[PDB]
Amino acid sequence: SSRKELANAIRALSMDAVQKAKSGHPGAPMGMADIAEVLWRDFLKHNPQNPSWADRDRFVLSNGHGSMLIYSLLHLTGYDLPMEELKNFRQLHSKTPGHPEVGKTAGVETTTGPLGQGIANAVGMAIAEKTLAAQFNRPGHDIVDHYTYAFMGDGCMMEGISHEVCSLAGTLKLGKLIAFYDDNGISIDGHVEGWFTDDTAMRFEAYGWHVIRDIDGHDAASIKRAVEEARAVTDKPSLLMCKTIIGFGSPNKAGTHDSHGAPLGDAEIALTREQLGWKYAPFEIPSEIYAQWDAKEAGQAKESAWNEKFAAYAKAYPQEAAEFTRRMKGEMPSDFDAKAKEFIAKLQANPAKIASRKASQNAIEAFGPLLPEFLGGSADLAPSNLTLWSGSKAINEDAAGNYIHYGVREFGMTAIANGISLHGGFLPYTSTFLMFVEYARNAVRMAALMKQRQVMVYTHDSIGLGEDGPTHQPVEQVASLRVTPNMSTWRPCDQVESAVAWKYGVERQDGPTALILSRQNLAQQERTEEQLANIARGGYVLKDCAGQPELIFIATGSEVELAVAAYEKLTAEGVKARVVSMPSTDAFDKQDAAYRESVLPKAVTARVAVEAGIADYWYKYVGLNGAIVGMTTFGESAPAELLFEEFGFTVDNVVAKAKELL
Amino acid sequence: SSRKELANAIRALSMDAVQKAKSGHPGAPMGMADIAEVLWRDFLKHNPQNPSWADRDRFVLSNGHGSMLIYSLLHLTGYDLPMEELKNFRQLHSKTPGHPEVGKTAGVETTTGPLGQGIANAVGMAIAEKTLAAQFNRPGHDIVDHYTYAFMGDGCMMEGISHEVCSLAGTLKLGKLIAFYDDNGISIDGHVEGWFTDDTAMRFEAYGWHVIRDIDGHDAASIKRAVEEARAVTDKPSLLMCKTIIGFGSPNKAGTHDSHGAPLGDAEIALTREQLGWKYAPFEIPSEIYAQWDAKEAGQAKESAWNEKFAAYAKAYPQEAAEFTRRMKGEMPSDFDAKAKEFIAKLQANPAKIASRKASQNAIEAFGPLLPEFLGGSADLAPSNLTLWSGSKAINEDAAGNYIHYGVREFGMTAIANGISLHGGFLPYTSTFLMFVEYARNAVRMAALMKQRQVMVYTHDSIGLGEDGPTHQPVEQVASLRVTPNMSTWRPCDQVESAVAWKYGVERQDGPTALILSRQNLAQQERTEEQLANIARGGYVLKDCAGQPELIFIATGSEVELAVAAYEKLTAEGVKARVVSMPSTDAFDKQDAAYRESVLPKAVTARVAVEAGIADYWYKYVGLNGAIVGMTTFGESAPAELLFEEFGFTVDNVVAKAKELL
Ligand SMILES: Cc1ncc(C[n+]2csc(CCOP(=O)(O)OP(=O)(O)O)c2C)c(N)n1
Ligand SMILES: Cc1ncc(C[n+]2csc(CCOP(=O)(O)OP(=O)(O)O)c2C)c(N)n1
Ligand SMILES: [Ca+2]
Ligand SMILES: [Ca+2]
């Protein structure tokens, strides 16, 4: 068959699956089918029977609303995605959800839908490939060598995150990142020139990318030659600007915004079939077309050849081969747990009153030699977030390094680290002040939705940062992380809880972990061995009375000290009080019921929560008959000690509130 | 005095004030003093005696950490900011907080600190001047004519929001926006070439800006000539790239990342005075330097001339003069309340089962003719968000219009609208799907912190949107808005509550209002005249029993219908139940104690909350002995009716949970 007929099979499946679901976006899949036919049949290195092959090329559909394009490609090339799933596009529990979801459908590399993040994830996959090749390849033993391809549309180019990630990709010279831009002149509001007039080619040359302009996106020969030129440029990422017609093939709706996001209609589909010359009924693909699209034979040959090369590598470099396999699987080193527990025990025995941001740097220093898979960075706040350790080597200086200077690009940083984690081989950690989790908020949600491991280090967590004032002092950000599904959030009260929280975050395989750290120094608390083990349960009894408590204080982070001092004052007056330290509400909520009742007994309703954060969160644990010493307003610019007094974080106010319940 | 000695006055005050506070950032203020001297003494049109003059030029310091730069300028030119406040920089309740704050210090036009948002607000100020001039100027009476100047640094340039708002500024041809870039080669991590290598001039030419490269930022004549040239380009915004030395004057710290954000030290300050030739003691400015910087005489002369122009304008165009005055004050038209009340009562009398996104478009259509100050827009979702009304005219087609096609730029859209609100003369509304409030989250927080009126229309509020799936279906976003100080959030259950929420939002002068709207149709509830009036109290009794209730349902938005059906089943079994509709928790919490107790009596603890959003928010109203029917996970891709069933939003499940409390 001609290349056009093969590309028309993508068009037929896309328009028919959107029509059957009566929902979805036919436009982009029909406008990009010729580009995808060239990319997938002539260049993409993959094996449909093993979507986990370590050295496969990575493809990312950043304009994720065109999901029928990737489902058509996966079906046609031989992945495990049967025609029956294409007929159940957008239906309950099918393997073809409205936007592609990683882990759910074989062959899908990331979850897209939120514009801009797929090209960010692809920059992260290209950094991972480059860095893993630099760390493991040996001359004649290049076991890491694969490209990262991305499709993106006008919506991704308008979003600010495309500027963050493509600017940094130009700095880091990612020659194996090749992006195809669907330049079709249309967005949801209509013709884009009323709101989008950039000279995009000139903008990308300003980032140091190689750019190929004016590619006829409906001519296979033109597309093929552009891909060949881009693959020969090895020191700059490439942008291929492909001029396409949205909804290509539809006599009445091609080139209009009406083909973007609704079914074409049965009558228009009949006309489109005739204009394309596509003679097959819905969901019918002839044998001859499958034979030209299937990639099972070539896929097995390419992976077979790589397995022979990896076996030769393991005979000369056995230790490196075992590390490569452990890291690609995301397995922890077998001695890690033991060494981390010894370090934690040592800190409990040698108290230090230091900020938890410094305790965090001390844990990175202790774990660094044990976890070569670290790939960490900070958004231009290394000296304040304290993310460098003695072994950090920045990858703009040494390609085989383990640290990234991300620049002032929080959202791009977090979504790039999600691409690092999806690639395999690394354990990324990212960092900025806690307020600026608001710049990166949806990339944090996307790590939790895609169940990816990433440690997020957020320092300067409250009015305790002082003079910078209310634009930087967090109030309500912690509560927003705590109610995000699948997010783990730790607010440690001293250097020991900080080390426990870092251990929990590196061992968490199915989701991210945010550490909420202080700028100011925190006193260490004394613990028995039983209490030291309970820190990982998220909430635990830190101070107790003989007999049952009449009053319970619940505190976190820097406010644990205040609740211990109030406990000391009330116990001296004969009150039976208890202090519960709650570094993580999500780890506590997961404990068995008898554990949670032994910490927070249901019969004790006189409960006081103490935290320099928005008060309304704490009704979950104190109920309507308790009291909350928290913030209800924005902060103020002044020295931290004065702010804690101004906002009621004093021993006298805590005791007074507790006494009102007695 | 030479220009350099006048600029050194800024340098001395800035390093000495940082030194006294022992906190703050001397680098940028020392680097940019010479540019500020030229701009403020030779070009800025302002009156220090009236910082609210409607036709003043607007100045924005986007690199807000250099706050002593603006406090020095306001003090020196004659604003009401005495030397004692400069001596109290960063101290509790001073008029010189660590980052500049609008509303607290005379002359400060916006609150900056979060990088990238200053330049976004400046773009909104320039949009507002252009649109207001087009609406009100008449031949021989140009009552609106002023520039918008912004200073920005490398941090602002790296942030994604600078691409969003500078790209749109180019499309809109904002000739009166002139930005100065502090090109000093340094950020907090060190020399920026490791992480920032853009050809910034070529990027801004790709946006359609006029760019002046390689300006010696320490040479007054070069700076003056570049401003003159930028002022003469009237159809493109200009970027002046000014090469400066960070910490200019300090022998040992100039040009290093050490001068960015820590005091220089007494010894260094002494050497800096010697290098600069600055002889005066700390906080000592000679009378002759004040005489050259004071702008009170010139400012009063220019405002006096504008006042006479406005009086002549009001004689020739009396209707337009009265509207200009009303809009600049932010007052409602005198018949708005009565007309809006009539529209609301009409809706209650003529029920319709429509989505609240459609009820929102219907309110825009009714209020549109009454509020010519609307300046609304959507982030490329006009046909889904339903933000156009019959009188919408986009400003890319007609400069006197009232609608902005923002493109796919949620964060730039929201911080531009903040700049439109700060300028005066308009009431902005912005819109996108609720999930993408996470892309613009810190701009939404800054609207609340600055106390600015903006209506934010967020549609597609829950798993009720259906097939687009978990990347798009909100779960925890409404709870994050509700715990933001000074944010108002409404989730109306039908077309009547929707109109009351829009009315509340346009009348709210001291903060923003978000409307949370459904994609799917909502049934209308019956109300007496008393219930109809209580909708604006945020929480009210919708259905009740005789005597004190034994069980109370609290529901919002699309779930009120489920709660009412559960009430009907339980009432038929003889339970005394009540249903409370709670469209706004923040308006309910502001009610007096007597009203809140009448709606939610403290003695009744059997309370059930029903809402398709994260469950943990609701402990605030249901306590520990109540139940919540909510979401605790991400959503799924499927038709809406099936998701409500799958996640437990059914009458039978709500009845079952309620019965467990009885
Ligand atoms: C961050 C974000 N904002 C808004 C949307 C809603 N949305 C989906 S596609 C789209 C614009 C369509 O533009 P383009 O990328 O040009 O796609 P095309 O119509 O050409 O396929 C928008 C606004 C989204 N998915 N993500
Ligand atoms: C959104 C955001 N992220 C991070 C910061 C913390 N921060 C303050 S200044 C700065 C970088 C300094 O760079 P530049 O703008 O070049 O300032 P200069 O040192 O040249 O004054 C950073 C990262 C911030 N204020 N806002
Ligand atoms: Ca497009
Ligand atoms: Ca700089």
User: Which tokens go with A473?
Assistant: 């002092």
The answer to whether residue A636 neighbours chain B at the CB level (below 8 Å) is: yes
Contacts of A56 (CB under 8 A, 6+ apart): A45, A46, A47, A146
For residues A513 and A488, the answer to whether their CB atoms sit within 8 Å is yes
User: Which tokens go with A401?
Assistant: 């390094």
A13 with A51, same domain: the answer is yes
B241 with B304, same domain: the answer is yes
Gap between the Cα atoms of B370 and B524, Å rounded:
26
Fill in the DSSP letter of residue A555. E
Experimental approach: X-ray
Contacts of B5 (CB under 8 A, 6+ apart): B277, B278, B289
A485 with A582, same domain: the answer is no
Gap between the Cα atoms of B543 and B559, Å rounded:
14
Q: How many CA atoms lie within 13 A of B531 on its CB side?
A: 17
Q: What is the dihedral of CA A6, A7, A12, A15, to 10 degrees?
A: 170
The answer to whether residue B202 neighbours chain A at the CB level (below 8 Å) is: yes
B519 with B426, same domain: the answer is yes
Gap between the Cα atoms of B144 and B150, Å rounded:
19
Reported as type and span, the H/E element at residue A239 is strand A238-243
Gap between the Cα atoms of B523 and B460, Å rounded:
17
Fill in the DSSP letter of residue B142. -
Gap between the Cα atoms of A569 and A548, Å rounded:
18
User: Which tokens go with B656?
Assistant: 């079952």
Residue of B127, B380, B602, B643 to mutate, interface with A, max A Cβ within 10 Å: B380
**Which residue bears the tokens 């009330």?**
A570
B529 with B638, same domain: the answer is no
Gap between the Cα atoms of A344 and A535, Å rounded:
11
Cα–Cα distance list, B138 to A203, B234, B456, B615 (Å)? 39, 19, 33, 56
Backbone angles phi, psi at A124, to 5 degrees: -60, -40
Cα–Cα distance list, B519 to A38, B355, B643 (Å)? 39, 6, 14
For residues B56 and B45, the answer to whether their CB atoms sit within 8 Å is yes
Residues with Cβ within 6 A of ligand 1? A 27-28, 63, 65, 113-115, 153-155, 182, 184, 186-188, 246, 260; B 380-381, 408, 436, 439
Fill in the DSSP letter of residue A183. E
Contacts of A319 (CB under 8 A, 6+ apart): none
B486 with B607, same domain: the answer is no
End-to-end CA distance of chain A: 85
Q: Which of B323, B551, B363, B585 is nearest to B479 (CA)?
A: B585
Gap between the Cα atoms of B113 and B18, Å rounded:
17
Interface touch B483/A617, C-beta < 8 Å: yes
Gap between the Cα atoms of B616 and B622, Å rounded:
10
CA distance A450 to chain B (A): 10
* Three-state secondary structure of B263-316: CCCHHHHHHHHHHHCCCCCCCCCCHHHHHHHCCHHHHHHHHHHHHHHHHHHHHH
Q: DSSP states of A36-59 as a string?
A: HHHIIIII----TT-TT-TT--EE
Partners of residue B602 in chain A, C-beta under 8 Å: 624
In this structure, the number of other CB atoms found within 10 A of the CB of residue B424 comes to 16
Gap between the Cα atoms of B179 and B157, Å rounded:
12
Give the residue, by CA position, lying nearest to ligand 2 atom 16: B154
In this structure, the number of other CB atoms found within 10 A of the CB of residue A405 comes to 23
Backbone angles phi, psi at B547, to 5 degrees: 80, -165
Separation of CA B152 and ligand 4 centre (Å): 9
In this structure, the number of other CB atoms found within 10 A of the CB of residue B83 comes to 13
Task: Give the three-class secondary structure for B403.
Answer: strand
Task: Say if strands A627-631 and B374-378 run parallel, antiparallel, or are unpaired.
Answer: unpaired
Interface touch B394/A194, C-beta < 8 Å: yes
A503 with A638, same domain: the answer is no
In this structure, the number of other CB atoms found within 10 A of the CB of residue A597 comes to 12
Reported as type and span, the H/E element at residue A442 is helix A441-449
Of B159, B187, B246, the residue with max ligand 2 atoms within 8 A of its CB, to mutate for a pocket test, comes to B187
For residues A542 and A581, the answer to whether their CB atoms sit within 8 Å is yes
Q: Closest ligand 1 atom, CA of B379?
A: 23
**Which residue bears the tokens 């590598």?**
A313
Q: Which of A237, A109, A134, A110 is nearest to A176 (CA)?
A: A237
The answer to whether residue B425 neighbours chain A at the CB level (below 8 Å) is: no
State how many domains chain B has. Answer: 3
Boundary-marking domain end, from B489, B504, B536: B536
B511 with B571, same domain: the answer is no
* Three-state secondary structure of B470-496: CCCCCCCHHHHHHCCCCCEEECCCCHH
User: Which tokens go with B290?
Assistant: 């004040």
Interface touch B408/A91, C-beta < 8 Å: no
Gap between the Cα atoms of A303 and B461, Å rounded:
45
CA A184 to chain CA centroid, nearest Å: 29
Reported as type and span, the H/E element at residue A642 is helix A640-646
Helix%, strand%, coil% for chain B, nearest 5: 45, 15, 40
What CATH number has the domain bearing residue A586?
3.40.50.920
What CATH number has the domain bearing residue A293?
3.40.50.970
CA distance B54 to chain A (A): 27
CA A183 to chain CA centroid, nearest Å: 27
B530 with B619, same domain: the answer is no
For residues B8 and B279, the answer to whether their CB atoms sit within 8 Å is no
Of A70, A187, A242, the residue with max ligand 1 atoms within 8 A of its CB, to mutate for a pocket test, comes to A187
Q: Which of A555, A553, A557, A556 is nearest to A544 (CA)?
A: A553
Number of CB pairs, chain A paired with chain B, less than 8 A apart: 321
Contacts of A256 (CB under 8 A, 6+ apart): A186, A246, A247
Residue type, A209: W
User: Which tokens go with A387?
Assistant: 């993310």
- Of the candidates A90, A412, A605, the beta carbon closest to that of B467 is on A90
The answer to whether residue A632 neighbours chain B at the CB level (below 8 Å) is: yes
Residue type, B107: G
Gap between the Cα atoms of A48 and A77, Å rounded:
7
Boundary-marking domain end, from A536, A551, A571: A536
Residue of B101, B157, B167 to mutate, interface with A, max A Cβ within 10 Å: B167
Boundary-marking domain end, from A501, A518, A536: A536
Reported as type and span, the H/E element at residue B442 is helix B441-449
Gap between the Cα atoms of B604 and B608, Å rounded:
11
The answer to whether residue B222 neighbours chain A at the CB level (below 8 Å) is: no
**Whole domain around residue A658: which residue ranges?**
537-662
Reported as type and span, the H/E element at residue A585 is helix A585-589
Look up A646 and say whether it is catalytic.
no
B222 with B248, same domain: the answer is yes
Gap between the Cα atoms of A305 and A235, Å rounded:
27
Task: Say if strands B521-522 and B488-490 run parallel, antiparallel, or are unpaired.
Answer: unpaired
For residues A25 and A18, the answer to whether their CB atoms sit within 8 Å is yes
For residues B493 and B583, the answer to whether their CB atoms sit within 8 Å is yes
B124 with B231, same domain: the answer is yes
B58 with B183, same domain: the answer is yes
**Which residue bears the tokens 């200019």?**
B248
Q: How many CA atoms lie within 13 A of A305 on its CB side?
A: 11
For residues B466 and B519, the answer to whether their CB atoms sit within 8 Å is yes
Gap between the Cα atoms of A241 and A213, Å rounded:
5
Residues with Cβ within 6 A of ligand 2? A 380-381, 408, 436, 439; B 27-28, 63, 65-66, 113-115, 153-155, 182, 184, 186-188, 246, 260
Q: Which of B129, B164, B373, B410 is catalytic?
A: B410
Give the residue, by CA position, lying nearest to ligand 1 atom 6: B381
Q: Which of B66, B539, B35 is nearest to B261 (CA)?
A: B66
**Cα nearest neighbour of A156 on chain B:** B408
The answer to whether residue B442 neighbours chain A at the CB level (below 8 Å) is: yes
Gap between the Cα atoms of A578 and A591, Å rounded:
20
